[PDB]
Structure 1
Amino acid sequence: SKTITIYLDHASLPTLNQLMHFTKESEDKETARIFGFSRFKLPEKITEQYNNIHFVEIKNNRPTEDIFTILDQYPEKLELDLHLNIAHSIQLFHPILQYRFKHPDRISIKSLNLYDDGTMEYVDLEKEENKDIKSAIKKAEKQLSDYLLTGKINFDNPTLARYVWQSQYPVKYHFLSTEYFEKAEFLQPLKTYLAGKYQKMDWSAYEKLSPEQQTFYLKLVGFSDETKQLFHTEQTKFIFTGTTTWEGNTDIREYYAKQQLNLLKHFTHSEGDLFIGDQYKIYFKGHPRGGDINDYILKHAKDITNIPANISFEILMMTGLLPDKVGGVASSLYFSLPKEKISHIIFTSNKKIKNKEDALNDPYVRVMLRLGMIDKSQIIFWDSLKQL
Structure 2
Amino acid sequence: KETVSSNSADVVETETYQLTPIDAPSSFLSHSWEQTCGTPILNESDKQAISFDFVAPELKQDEKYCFTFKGITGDHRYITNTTLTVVAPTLEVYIDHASLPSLQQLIHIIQAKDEYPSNQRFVSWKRVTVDADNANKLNIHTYPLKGNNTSPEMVAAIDEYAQSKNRLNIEFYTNTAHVFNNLPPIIQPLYNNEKVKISHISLYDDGSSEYVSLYQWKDTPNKIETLEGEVSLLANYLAGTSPDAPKGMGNRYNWHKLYDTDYYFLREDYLDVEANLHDLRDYLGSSAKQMPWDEFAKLSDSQQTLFLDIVGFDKEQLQQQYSQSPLPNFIFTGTTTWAGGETKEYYAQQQVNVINNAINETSPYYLGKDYDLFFKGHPAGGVINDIILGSFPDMINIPAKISFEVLMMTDMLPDTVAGIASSLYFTIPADKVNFIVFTSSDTITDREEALKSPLVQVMLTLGIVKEKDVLFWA
TM-score band by shorter chain is: 0.7 to 0.9
Closer, same or farther: CA 262–149 of 1 in aligned 2, 3 Å: farther
Q: Is the 8 A contact 1:244 1:256 kept in 2?
A: yes
Distance 1:41 1:64 in 2: 17
Measured against aligned partners, the alpha-carbon deviations of 1:211-256 in whole angstroms (never above 9, x if no partner) come to 33222222222222333322222222100124579x9x9x799697
- Are residue 11 (structure 1) and residue 60 (structure 2) matched? no
Closer, same or farther: CA 208–298 of 1 in aligned 2, 3 Å: same
Q: Which has the higher helix share?
A: 1
Distance 1:73 1:340 in 2: 50
| Cα offset, 1:268, TM superposition | 4.4
- Are residue 87 (structure 1) and residue 174 (structure 2) matched? no
TM-score (normalised: structure 2): 0.70
Give the match for residue 62 of structure 1: 149
Structure 2: which 5+ residue stretches go unaligned?
1-87
Closer, same or farther: CA 378–10 of 1 in aligned 2, 3 Å: closer
Q: Is the 8 A contact 1:236 1:280 kept in 2?
A: yes
Closer, same or farther: CA 273–59 of 1 in aligned 2, 3 Å: farther
Q: Is the 8 A contact 1:119 1:331 kept in 2?
A: no
Give the match for residue 7 of structure 2: none
Q: Is the 8 A contact 2:234 2:250 kept in 1?
A: no
Please tell me the residue identity of whatever aligns with 1:221.
V
Q: Is the 8 A contact 1:3 1:31 kept in 2?
A: yes
Correspondence 1:44-63 to 2 at 5 A:
44-50=132-138, 52-63=139-150
Aligned length: 374
Mean Cα deviation higher: 178-187 or 32-41: 32-41
Aligned mate of 1:238, from 326, 330, 335: 330
Give the match for residue 473 of structure 2: 382
Higher relative contact order (CA 8 A, sep 6+): 1
Measured against aligned partners, the alpha-carbon deviations of 1:6-25 in whole angstroms (never above 9, x if no partner) come to 11013111111111101112
Closer, same or farther: CA 183–309 of 1 in aligned 2, 3 Å: same
Correspondence 1:297-308 to 2 at 5 A:
297-301=385-389, 302-303=392-393, 304-308=395-399
Give the match for residue 223 of structure 2: 133
Measured against aligned partners, the alpha-carbon deviations of 1:131-184 in whole angstroms (never above 9, x if no partner) come to 12321221332321232123745324x035311111110001111101111111
Aligned mate of 2:460, from 360, 364, 369: 369
Closer, same or farther: CA 160–186 of 1 in aligned 2, 3 Å: farther
| Cα offset, 1:38, TM superposition | 6.2
| Cα offset, 1:204, TM superposition | 1.9
Closer, same or farther: CA 29–252 of 1 in aligned 2, 3 Å: farther
3-state SS, counterpart of residue 125 of structure 2 = coil
Distance 1:82 1:295 in 2: 41
Correspondence 1:163-174 to 2 at 5 A:
163-174=253-264
Give the match for residue 11 of structure 2: none
Distance 2:469 2:229 in 1: 40
Give the match for residue 288 of structure 2: 198
Give the match for residue 100 of structure 1: 190
3-state SS, counterpart of residue 47 of structure 1 = helix
3-state SS, counterpart of residue 36 of structure 1 = strand
Give the match for residue 64 of structure 2: none
Distance 1:160 1:366 in 2: 24
Give the match for residue 109 of structure 1: 198
Aligned mate of 1:186, from 276, 282, 286: 276
Closer, same or farther: CA 39–55 of 1 in aligned 2, 3 Å: farther
Aligned mate of 1:42, from 130, 145, 170: 130
Mean Cα deviation higher: 31-40 or 127-136: 31-40
Distance 2:168 2:432 in 1: 47
Please tell me the residue identity of whatever aligns with 2:329.
K
Distance 1:116 1:360 in 2: 23
3-state SS, counterpart of residue 157 of structure 2 = helix
TM-score (normalised: structure 1): 0.84
Please tell me the residue identity of whatever aligns with 2:372.
K
Q: Is the 8 A contact 2:255 2:261 kept in 1?
A: yes
| Cα offset, 1:99, TM superposition | 3.0
Q: Which has the higher strand share?
A: 2
